[PDB]
Amino acid sequence: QFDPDSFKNKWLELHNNERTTRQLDSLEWDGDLAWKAQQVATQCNVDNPQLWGDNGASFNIGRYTKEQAFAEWTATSGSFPDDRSIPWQRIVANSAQKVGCGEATCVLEGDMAYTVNVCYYDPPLSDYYTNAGD
């Protein structure tokens, strides 16, 4: 029960609204990332996911609906440029060109299931100066 076309659209809109406000170039969807995202998402592990590749940690992860998950990431803007803002940094980085997101439905024993959301970014986040470079 899944509409891929609308799924890409919603995620792109969330990301690109945030960036458009801030005079940034929009991100384009990349399926490879979206696939990677799903791989991570499927594990049902927010804290300790098993990752692979050079850009393996270049991603955001969050619980519940898309809007809620995205907001929890952008909510960290407050403390930029410290490490707590890294989530928001991924979204807003000037160097960033591509995103791909993926989900999975995970359970709490004898409780309502919840969604796990993951988005991957390319190129990966670097140092403070590089991220704002064009």
Residue numbers in the entry: 31 to 164
Quote the passages of the study that discuss this structure, keeping the authors' original sentences:
We present in this report the structure of MpPR-1i, a SCP/TAPS protein expressed by M. perniciosa during biotrophic stage of WBD, in basidiomes, and in monokaryotic mycelia. PR-1 proteins are members of the eukaryotic CAP (cysteine-rich secretory protein/antigen 5/pathogenesis related-1) or SCP/TAPS (Sperm-coating protein/Tpx/antigen 5/pathogenesis related-1/Sc7) superfamily of proteins, which has been implicated in biological processes like reproduction, fungal virulence, cellular defense, and immune evasion. Each monomer of MpPR-1i has a conserved alpha-beta-alpha sandwich topology made up of 3 β strands sandwiched between two helical domains, connected by loops.
The structure was refined and extended to higher resolution, using a 2.43 Å native data set. The MpPR-1i crystal has very high solvent content, ~70%, which is clearly demonstrated by the solvent channel in the crystal packing viewed along a cell dimension. This explains why MpPR-1i does not bind Zn2+ used in the crystallization solution. The shortened length of the CBM loop significantly reduces the size of the sterol binding cavity, rendering it barely large enough to accommodate dioxane and definitely too small to accommodate cholesterol.
